[PDB]
């Protein structure tokens, strides 16, 4: 509708990744979420929206998918977790750890 091939690549990224963090390189919230997953020994796919060509168009399409306008924007095992606050809440509640343990198939 905006960019059909971009929409498709973003979805494919989420579908194939145990964790995908849509981030910005300089953002301390992004930095904080990355550190959380690193502490848990979890490898993540990170897409730095400030470092991709047409990152504005990517954020726009990503808001269409997720109904969220801010970064960071976190998916775990294909489930939208949300922003930094929601990810730390998921950590505190046990949600994050249970989502991370679920069996899934990751292509590549
Ligand atoms: Cl650009």
107 exposure class (CB count in 10 Å sphere: 0-12, 13-18, 19+): exposed
Structure determination technique employed: X-ray
Cβ-based neighbour number of residue 38 at 10 Å: 11
Residue 53 alpha carbon to ligand 1 centre in Å: 4
What is the 22 CA–ligand 1 centroid distance (Å)?
A: 16
What residues are paired with 50 via a beta bridge?
A: none
Torsion sign, CA atoms 90, 91, 92, 94: positive
Q: How far is the C-alpha of 61 from the C-alpha of 100, rounded, in Å? A: 25
Domains and CATH numbers, the chain: 1-108 (3.40.30.10)
């Amino acid at each position: 509708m905006a960019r059909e091939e971009l929409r498709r690549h973003l979805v494919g990224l989420i579908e194939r990744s145990r964790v995908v963090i849509f981030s910005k390189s300089y953002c301390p919230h992004s930095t904080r979420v990355k550190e959380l997953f690193s502490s848990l020994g979890v490898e993540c796919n990170v897409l730095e929206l400030d470092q991709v060509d047409d990152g504005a168009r990517v954020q726009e399409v990503l808001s269409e998918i997720t109904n969220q306008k801010t970064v960071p924007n976190i998916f775990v095992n294909k489930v939208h977790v949300g922003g930094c606050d929601q990810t730390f809440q998921a950590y505190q509640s046990g949600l994050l750890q249970k989502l991370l343990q679920e069996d899934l198939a990751y292509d590549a």
